Design a protein around this ligand. Structure first.
Ligand code: CLA
Ligand code: CLA
Ligand code: CLA
Ligand code: CLA
Ligand code: CLA
Ligand SMILES: CCCCCCCCCCCC(=O)OC\C(C#C[C@@]12O[C@]1(C)C[C@@H](O)CC2(C)C)=C/C=C/C(C)=C/C=C/C=C(C)/C=C/C=C(\C)C=C=C1C(C)(C)C[C@H](OC(C)=O)C[C@@]1(C)O
Ligand SMILES: CCCCCCCCCCCC(=O)OC\C(C#C[C@@]12O[C@]1(C)C[C@@H](O)CC2(C)C)=C/C=C/C(C)=C/C=C/C=C(C)/C=C/C=C(\C)C=C=C1C(C)(C)C[C@H](OC(C)=O)C[C@@]1(C)O
Ligand SMILES: CC(=O)O[C@H]1CC(C)(C)C(=C=C/C(C)=C/C=C/C(C)=C/C=C/C=C(C)/C=C/C=C(\C)C(=O)C[C@@]23O[C@]2(C)C[C@@H](O)CC3(C)C)[C@](C)(O)C1
Ligand code: KC2
Ligand code: KC2
Ligand SMILES: CC1=C(C#C/C(C)=C/C=C/C(C)=C/C=C/C=C(C)/C=C/C=C(C)/C=C/[C@@]23O[C@]2(C)C[C@@H](O)CC3(C)C)C(C)(C)C[C@H](O)C1
Lengths: 193, 188, 179, 47, 193
């Protein structure tokens, strides 16, 4: 809700709300909740993207065919950046369709992160309680229920770890994209990237 | 002070009626047609357009795939072809009988018979017979039909613009990559 | 996890979990682990028995597999991977689809779900149509469930030995280099 | 005649072209019933 | 709810109603009666069609002639799919006329199923009670009264079996037709059917 009560203040920025600009002071409370939800979304997206980009650069690909006549090796041979274009249109159409479904379902839950919901706490079972739609009760987060064996303090510590890993992941994925676009912008990125 | 729930910077009008006499009242009436025309007439027109647009978009999509053995025409030229054949005359005749009866009902409803805006009483299968579900099903009908108007407009316009059968999408959208990230040139 | 069965004298009465994957497992996670173990064990038992029968020299299925297209059980050969390559794609799709239907029936039809407080590995139709394991007491039934787990764990290692011998040649001893 | 279902198929698949470039605006405006001279002259009743 | 008091619930979906999309929850009870009546009619028609299509696929036909020029074997020669097209027109018209008579007489019963009667319980004598119309009283279902020998619980179990078999045949006949249309869509069907 309010930045004083929110997590994320780390040690890297001195046990203090790191807001160099006056954004938190200038904006209202629900704007802060929107920012926190977007921060978590960015961190999680960038974590997945960074791991996938590293895998693509390492050329590790599943044994089989992405499509009939199109092998995972075939799409991965040119590089990580070009693999997305090499993917057939229907596959990423399906990916963006399921992402549309996930985003719309997570946004449709009524205790909204802006309107009295925990920001960043995506509702598990997002496709549940929806008329005209049935999906198996596979939780979006932790389908195996890994977090059940954690205490509240441990869960808070791991939420802090989530935030501090997500910020690094945003930095890393933008580093990968910038290095590929403008060579030499990001060193430690060889020709494979 | 009641503000329109669709445009919270405008006051409700007045001619829209009590907030909620009509399913779907989100107060969306920036141009104030309710002052000129009566709301019952406007709502009868709304539901007629909804139903016709639903049937039209479904028929367009269906005719893009399947047609009867006699009619070997595409969806665009079907109108001219079946006017020449004479089927559209039959559709006009029968829909005109139905529409004369409908117009008599609109006249009675406006003069104060008691009939609701678009309640023809058509309920053979018994959907919405329970009053609890009736308002929700009216709202769903309105939502689906108001979507179907835009659906049919996009169907026809994109169909003529592109020349493609079902998706109404250009050849570059269908064949090429609409989710590309490598730098594009001048043309799609 | 200590009260979940599968422990035996082979571990020493204790749970074998060196990496600590049981510490980070809740009741639902532990149920998932047992369900996956049971499924993998059963699949590996069937796979090892089939591969051993086919490659060893046992009397395989008489007759044709496909009258049209001219594929025969004898013609498919005794190498397991070559046989699964030469079986028709229609047959492969059919086997996979029936297994999928059975998986979805196991997931949905068993309403008290193994994740949502149920018995892991309780596929209802695909067990004992003739009622053999009907009058067994709970003690011997628990003994036999532990037998299932142990035998199938061995079967998983066996089938992985088989595919390792086929992929990485001359990998496992007591498996000729071809497969 | 062809009774649909009795002495003929029921619903028959339609003939379609596999994609294509955008027709020029003047290609269909010059044949449209409202924005073409011949289209207007043909957009009349018949008896 | 009327949906809570039927025989179609089966252990294959647990001990619970199979309404994934809430169609039965979004309709009034009259539509639920219509749904059950149409479900059972569809199931029964489907199993008739399924066994008939299997018989046609096996090239099994009566000894004799379906007309004065065609033979049963001749009209069955091409296969089950084209058999209906190759049937003579007058025979198709006669089948359609008798089906019209059946589905008019069964509809014209005043208890009905939509308006206060058992859905799926077709009146055993559709053409009785019709003024100035005579029928030989061959009762439509159980003409030789098999179900009379059963107890109430036995015929309840068999009604459950009817629903199950009708649904399975609903799937099966469409599997046959779809396999004929798209080759390889249903791999269990050979090229013969
Ligand atoms: C072919 C065109 C078509 C048709 C016939 C319908 C029909 C329907 N829509 Mg609509 N709809 C369409 C296109 C169409 N839609 C499209 C393209 C969209 C997305 C852009 C929507 C978005 C939409 C929404 C958001 C909602 C509807 C709803 C409904 C249902 C109204 C309430 C009801 O009967 O609940 C009882 C009936 C059912 C639960 C329907 C179950 C039928 C399944 C989905 C059949 C499987 C598809 C089949 C092969 C065709 C009705 C069945 C309302 C609803 O309740 O949806 C379920 C609703 O809230 N529709
Ligand atoms: C806005 C509604 C609308 C309009 C104006 C038309 C107009 C036309 N349709 Mg139809 N059509 C519609 C809806 C509509 N359709 C719908 C909803 C379907 C899906 C079932 C179809 C399916 C369809 C086919 C398969 C074909 C046509 C064809 C035609 C043409 C000849 C009439 C005919 O045989 O119709 C047939 C109409 C029906 C069988 C639908 C009857 C049911 C209505 C919608 C009432 C439902 C509620 C009671 C004509 C241009 C023919 C043509 O020329 O194709 C190139 C043709 O072959 N239509
Ligand atoms: C699909 C594979 C699989 C799975 C899901 C399990 C699951 C389980 N085993 Mg294990 N196990 C397996 C194969 C598997 N086993 C095999 C083949 C053997 C024979 C060597 C064993 C031998 C064995 C013993 C001796 C015992 C267990 C036990 C257990 C439980 C330990 C708790 C835990 O967190 O495990 C989770 C495990 C995983 C998620 C493993 C994932 C794969 C790893 C990380 C990589 C592969 C390693 C490679 C092949 C070497 C759990 C139900 C204990 C038990 O019954 O506790 C009640 C027990 O006593 N297992
Ligand atoms: C579960 C793993 C598995 C897999 C992937 C395969 C795969 C294959 N087997 Mg099979 N097979 C299996 C288990 C398996 N088998 C088992 C457990 C046995 C018993 C020893 C056999 C015995 C066997 C023979 C004798 C032959 C094949 C053959 C084949 C090939 C063609 C498919 C076929 O008709 O198989 C038949 C598959 C089965 C009968 C499934 C096994 C039984 C399952 C688990 C259900 C339980 C039913 C129960 C025992 C019935 C009792 C009554 C294919 C490569 C043929 C081939 O090409 O050989 C060269 C062939 O002739 N298999
Ligand atoms: C009087 C002539 C006649 C006869 C005897 C039949 C008979 C038949 N038609 Mg139909 N049909 C006819 C005229 C006729 N048709 C006409 C004029 C049209 C144009 C609208 C159609 C359009 C049509 C289609 C699109 C299809 C059929 C099909 C069928 C068959 C499926 C039966 C069915 O589902 O009935 C259902 C009938 C009802 C629920 C009642 C509707 C009629 C009453 C009087 C109202 C059946 C043999 C199907 C087929 O080919 O199956 C292989 C099919 O897909 N017919
Ligand atoms: C089968 C089922 C398996 C279940 C799995 C569950 C599962 O995975 O759950 C998901 C999961 C989990 C879990 C747990 O539940 C578990 C298992 C147990 C439970 O108790 C607790 C939790 C936690 C809930 C974690 C996931 C974490 C992720 C994905 C983190 C991703 C993180 C990406 C980053 C940092 C990318 C960084 C990129 C960088 C730095 C880029 C860069 C560079 C370099 C080039 C590198 C170096 C260069 O430097 C120079 C040039 O000098 C600078 C820069 C910027 O250019
Ligand atoms: C002569 C004297 C006259 C007496 C006659 C008596 C009489 O007719 O009685 C009529 C009668 C009766 C009776 C009784 O009253 C009796 C006599 C005594 C009394 O106590 C009890 C009752 C019951 C009241 C019932 C009849 C029920 C019927 C016909 C049900 C028919 C039902 C067909 C189906 C389900 C077909 C399904 C097809 C499928 C699933 C097709 C398929 C496939 C495959 C290709 C196979 C494989 C593929 O798999 C892959 C691809 O991998 C999957 C799939 C789906 O594609
Ligand atoms: C030195 C070296 O490297 O060696 C190599 C060579 C070597 C040793 C060969 C290797 C291997 C592979 C091995 C050893 C693989 C082992 C595989 C294994 C262990 C496979 C079990 C199948 C069980 C089944 C199908 C049981 C069904 C049983 C059924 C259907 C029943 O239980 C039914 C029933 O009983 C009940 C429950 C109740 C009772 O009333 C009676 C009945 C009948 C009704 C390795 C790993 O490569 C190492
Ligand atoms: C976000 C993840 C994701 C999900 C949840 C998901 C679910 C389902 C389901 C649901 C149960 C079905 C039934 C289904 C079916 C097919 N998927 Mg699919 N899919 C996902 C991702 C991708 C990607 C990336 C590709 C892909 C493809 C195919 C092809 C191949 C056809 C072909 O061989 O041409 C078929 C038949 C590939 C493709 O379309 O290639 C042209 C391809 O690249 N999918 N997919
Ligand atoms: C269940 C449905 C059904 C019923 C209840 C029913 C009843 C009666 C009755 C009593 C009420 C009479 C008196 C009668 C008479 C004839 N039926 Mg008929 N019939 C049914 C079905 C078929 C089919 C499928 C065919 C057919 C035919 C003939 C021919 C052959 C003429 C010929 O030799 O050409 C003659 C004379 C065949 C046909 O139309 O042939 C052109 C043909 O294929 N029927 N049919
Ligand atoms: C619901 C509603 C409304 C509406 C509506 C709408 C738009 C309804 C539309 C209905 C529609 C579109 C219904 C088509 C039927 C087609 C038939 C029966 C075709 C016969 C075809 C026959 C008999 C024959 C065809 C042939 O090819 C055959 C087989 C042989 C060939 O030799 C040649 C011939 C030509 C002979 C209102 C009234 C507007 C307002 C109200 O508020 C809400």
């Amino acid at each position: 809700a309010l930045v004083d009560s929110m997590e994320g203040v780390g040690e890297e920025t001195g046990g203090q709300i790191w807001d160099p600009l006056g954004i938190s002071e200038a904006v209202s409370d629900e704007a802060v909740m929107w920012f926190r939800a977007s921060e978590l979304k960015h961190g999680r997206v960038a974590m997945l993207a960074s791991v996938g980009y590293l895998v693509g650069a390492a050329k590790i690909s599943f044994p089989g065919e992405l499509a009939k006549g199109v092998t995972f090796a075939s799409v991965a041979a040119n590089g990580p950046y070009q693999a997305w274009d090499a993917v057939p249109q229907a596959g990423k159409l399906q990916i963006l369709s399921i992402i549309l479904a996930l985003e719309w379902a997570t946004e449709a839950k009524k205790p909204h992160y802006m309107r009295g919901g925990v920001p960043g706490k995506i509702e598990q079972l997002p496709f549940d309680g929806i008329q005209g739609l049935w999906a198996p009760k596979i939780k979006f987060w932790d389908p195996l229920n890994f977090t059940g064996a954690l205490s509240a303090e441990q869960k808070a510590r791991k939420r802090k770890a989530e935030l501090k890993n997500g910020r690094l992941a945003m930095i890393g994925i933008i580093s990968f994209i910038t290095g590929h676009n403008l060579p030499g912008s990001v060193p430690a990125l060889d020709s494979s990237f | 002070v009641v503000y329109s729930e669709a445009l919270p910077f405008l006051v409700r009008r007045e001619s829209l009626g009590p907030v909620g006499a009509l399913v779907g009242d989100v107060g969306f009436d920036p141009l104030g047609f309710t002052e000129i025309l009566p709301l019952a007439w406007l709502r009868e027109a709304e539901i007629k357009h909804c139903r016709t647009a639903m049937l039209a978009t479904f028929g367009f999509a269906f005719t893009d795939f399947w047609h009867f053995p006699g009619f070997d025409y595409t969806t665009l030229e079907a109108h001219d072809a079946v006017i020449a054949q004479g089927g559209m005359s039959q559709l006009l005749l029968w829909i005109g009988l139905l529409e004369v009866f409908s117009a008599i009902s609109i006249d009675q409803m406006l003069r104060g018979s008691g009939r609701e805006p678009g309640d023809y009483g058509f309920d053979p299968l018994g959907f919405a017979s329970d009053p609890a579900k009736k308002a929700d099903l009216q709202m769903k009908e309105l939502a689906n039909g108001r979507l179907a108007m835009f659906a049919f407009g996009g169907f026809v316009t994109q169909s003529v613009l592109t020349g493609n059968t079902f998706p109404y999408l250009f050849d570059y959208q269908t064949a090429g990559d609409i989710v590309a990230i490598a730098a594009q040139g001048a043309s799609p | 996890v200590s009260d979940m069965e599968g422990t035996g004298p082979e571990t020493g009465g204790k749970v074998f979990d060196p990496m600590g994957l049981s510490k980070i497992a809740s009741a639902e996670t532990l149920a998932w682990y047992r369900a996956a173990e049971l499924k993998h064990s059963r699949v590996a038992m069937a796979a090892v028995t089939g591969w051993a029968w086919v490659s060893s020299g046992g009397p395989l299925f008489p007759g044709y597999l496909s009258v049209e297209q001219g594929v025969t059980f004898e013609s498919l050969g005794r190498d397991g991977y070559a046989a699964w390559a030469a079986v028709p794609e229609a047959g492969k799709f059919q086997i996979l689809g029936v297994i999928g239907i059975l998986e979805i029936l196991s997931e949905s039809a068993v309403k008290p779900h193994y994740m949502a407080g149920g018995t892991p590995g309780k596929v209802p139709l695909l067990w004992d149509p003739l009622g053999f394991t009907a009058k067994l007491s709970p003690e011997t039934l628990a003994r036999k469930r532990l037998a299932e787990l142990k035998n199938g764990r061995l079967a998983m290692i066996g089938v992985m030995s088989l595919v390792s011998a086929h992929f990485i040649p001359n990998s496992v001893p007591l498996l000729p280099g071809s497969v | 005649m062809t009774i649909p279902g009795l002495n003929a198929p029921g619903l028959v698949p339609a003939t379609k072209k596999p994609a294509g470039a955008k027709p020029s605006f003047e290609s269909y405006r010059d044949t449209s019933h409202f924005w073409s001279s011949q289209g207007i002259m043909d957009s009349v009743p018949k008896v």
